[PDB]
Ligand binder design. Structure first.
Ligand SMILES: Nc1ncnc2c1ncn2[C@@H]1O[C@H](COP(=O)(O)OP(=O)(O)O)[C@@H](O)[C@H]1O
Ligand SMILES: Nc1ncnc2c1ncn2[C@@H]1O[C@H](COP(=O)(O)OP(=O)(O)O)[C@@H](O)[C@H]1O
Ligand SMILES: [Mg+2]
Ligand SMILES: [Mg+2]
Lengths: 131, 367, 367
């Protein structure tokens, strides 16, 4: 089941992202690449969720699956943008530690919202696989 | 293999396969559509949110229970409860298991028919049985004699049963409890400035109906001792940081089950409907209905019962007639632990309604 | 090729194509006619100078901000703003690509219609959409919930959004900041013996609002330490070399946004207007408007906030309530970094006002 495979891949990347955000200035390039890799996996979940929805035999489950998966593009796009912002704050000539910490908290929060939407997408995908 | 015990709760629908221990899924059944407009874009939101998530995301919806006075308001929302629950919670297809559904003891026709009929054509179930929630609470309480109390928001009942037959000439249905007790609690916390005038916000009141409220042992002396300086008032904390202090009303609200004068409804109290149903049965049987008074439902988990209920019956009852009140642990799941015993039993597998027999026979099989 | 995000700033109009870094063209909206007689005899100069040239030639012009009280003076100067940005800065025609335009959260009708209508007939864009500046700042903030503060010279706003619905009854419009902070700064800079009452020269005052002003942690105690013999004065330099020494007034001017009594106007401060929007929303949501407080606009980039804002709110807020008010760097471009995410996404490619619908149905259902 390639949605479950993508979701487990995303979880392993999110475990690596968790390790990277606890580091110092040395995790800068790794953190940007991790976010890029997570966004690539989220696009695969969205593509597969639409395909599973097409193959499903009930309008209601299909509608719910389309509703939840359509937020994944906007949140994954915000993760890519917020990663560019955080990149320009790391190593900046004058920047506050409190502002850096709040940017990290926002980035983790956005990742948590993306993961929660994918978690709900998995629940509806499991339900869609019945019919 | 194993059948499914699915209880069509008053509250508080319960679902789990047959046995062994406690229900796998319990949920409040509420649907709420979003009254406000979306600006995040997509829309990316569900058309109506079911529970649990409609109790984790309140105040942006208008919560509507699908069951109103023990009858389904529309099967359009009900079928959606069922579909959501079976598919994205339990993760089961209704065609895999013969099922067990529940109803109320005294309820309007064609509520059990329309249910059975729609559920067979929509979900394509292979076999079904429909049991009343009260009868199942006997098996859960390990007995076959006694008057059974299935008390939920918003229909309570008082059904007398004697080893091992039902007495039809003494059956009582009260619509007095429990959502009207919720609505009354909301009116007397509004009386101390704690405003909860909207449908969704009423749910928080229902949670405060669980924990803070209790049954007084003696009303008149608790009213006296409430006027005394030492506190019976408790300070609650609210999601926006607010502190709510309730005290006098705290023991008044559950007492309503004995005293319907608080509501302003004429319907007789549980005290008197218990007594008046026993004293409508034949003389010899009355002997064994006493001391087999069996409670059930989540609404009987209050402190101060059963020895208020006991003392009130013992005060009206004849001389040296002993009353014991049968209280199971964790009464909210009593009905479900009942259902598990029924659908698992042999030889009663052939007293189910199976799809092939049902096609020729029609809904005349149900009743 | 790609769509174009042009943000109708209060200040400070901002323009740049869809993504990926920072705006291409920014200027402080000023148009200025030449107020002195010519002796160059061609004459060979612009009829009225726009920015940057109207910020390069102060003292020979009369600067006129074309947007005041959040509404534009005339579309005769506004079209000239647009024409200059698209043609002699960006080097583009809107005929090639759909645009994205912005407006204010609360303004008079039919000024968004008239804008949309004039821009379709003059510049002949094939599709358009008009977004409020606050909603776009959600995308930029990385959040799906929170109260959005878009504060520019001269209209600030307070819009609450909850996952991800708008809360209509709680939206607050303050005309309190920022051109009135500029005007107040000019009256207490008059206290240090320099003349700034003239229209062009008012821009120099605005620049001293950017760099020099700072927000005190507590007014009464910063006033205490001002009385000390240890200096609190900072030396500013004026364009022809003059030295202005401001100290006390430096923290007096921003304090105005907490205390409107300094202006002598009657509207309530950011302090109470923050609270009053939360306390007109339903109980369950009130928890999560807290800690998702997002500031925006260039006028909020003082380092004395957010821990002033924190200390003021934390004093009025209930006990043990989550408070996180720290805002993103570079708030002046927040809206634009928002706009880029929106107009690039599907499904909302199909939520633009198309030319075919504009011709057939006019500016129906714009807001
Ligand atoms: N500790 C408690 N004290 C009082 N009421 C309770 C308690 N726990 C649960 N309840 C009530 O139990 C109700 C649910 O009753 P339930 O047993 O589900 O009815 P039913 O048997 O008919 O399905 C809820 O509405 C709730 O108010
Ligand atoms: N460092 C700063 N401190 C305070 N004010 C600033 C600073 N930098 C810019 N500003 C102010 O920001 C204003 C522009 O706000 P802006 O964000 O453009 O409003 P808007 O979002 O509504 O277009 C200017 O008028 C300027 O005075
Ligand atoms: Mg019940
Ligand atoms: Mg703005």
């Amino acid at each position: 089941n390639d949605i479950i495979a993508a979701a487990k891949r995303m979880a392993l990347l999110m475990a690596e992202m968790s390790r990277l955000v606890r580091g110092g200035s040395g995790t800068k390039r790794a953190l940007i690449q991790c976010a890029k890799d997570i966004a690539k996996a989220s696009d695969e979940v969205t593509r597969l969720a639409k395909e599973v929805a097409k193959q499903c035999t009930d309008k209601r489950i299909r509608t719910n699956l389309l509703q939840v998966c359509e937020r994944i593009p906007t949140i994954s796009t915000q993760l890519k943008i917020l990663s560019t912002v955080k990149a320009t704050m790391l190593g900046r000539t004058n920047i506050s530690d409190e502002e850096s910490e709040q940017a990290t908290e926002m980035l983790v929060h956005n990742a948590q919202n993306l993961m929660q939407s994918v978690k709900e997408t998995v629940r509806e995908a499991e339900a869609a696989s019945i019919k | 293999t194993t059948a499914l015990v699915c209880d069509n709760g008053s509250g508080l629908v319960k679902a789990g396969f047959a046995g062994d221990d406690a229900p796998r899924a319990v949920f409040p059944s509420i649907v709420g559509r979003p009254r406000h407009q979306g600006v995040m874009v997509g829309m990316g939101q569900k058309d109506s949110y079911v529970g649990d998530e409609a109790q984790s995301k309140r105040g942006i919806l208008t919560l509507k229970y699908p069951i109103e006075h023990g009858i389904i308001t529309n099967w359009d929302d009900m079928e959606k409860i069922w579909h959501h629950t079976f598919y994205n919670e339990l993760r089961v297809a209704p065609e895999e298991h013969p099922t067990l559904l529940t109803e109320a003891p005294l309820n309007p026709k064609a509520n059990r028919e329309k249910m059975t009929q729609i559920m067979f054509e929509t979900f394509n179930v292979p076999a079904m049985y429909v049991a009343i929630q009260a009868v199942l609470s006997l098996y859960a309480s390990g007995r076959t004699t006694g008057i059974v109390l299935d008390s939920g928001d918003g229909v309570t009942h008082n059904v007398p049963i004697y080893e091992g037959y039902a007495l039809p000439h003494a059956i009582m249905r009260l619509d007095l409890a429990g959502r009207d007790l919720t609505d009354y609690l909301m009116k007397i916390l509004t009386e101390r400035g704690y405003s909860f005038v909207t449908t969704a916000e009423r749910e928080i009141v229902r949670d405060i109906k669980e924990k803070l409220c209790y049954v007084a042992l003696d009303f008149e002396n608790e009213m006296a001792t409430a006027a005394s300086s030492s506190s019976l008032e408790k300070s609650y904390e609210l999601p926006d940081g607010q502190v709510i202090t309730i005290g006098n009303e705290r023991f008044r609200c559950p007492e309503t089950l004995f005293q319907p004068s608080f509501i302003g409804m004429e319907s007789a109290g549980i005290h008197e409907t218990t007594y008046n149903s026993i004293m409508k049965c034949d003389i010899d049987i009355r002997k064994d209905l006493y001391a087999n008074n069996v409670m059930s439902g989540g609404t009987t988990m209050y402190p101060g019962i059963a020895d208020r209920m006991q003392k009130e019956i013992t005060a009206l009852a004849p001389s040296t007639m002993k009353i014991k009140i049968i209280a199971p642990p964790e009464r909210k799941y009593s009905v479900w632990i009942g259902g598990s015993i029924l659908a698992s039993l042999s030889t009663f597998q052939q007293m189910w309604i199976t799809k092939q027999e049902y096609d020729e026979a029609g809904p005349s099989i149900v009743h």
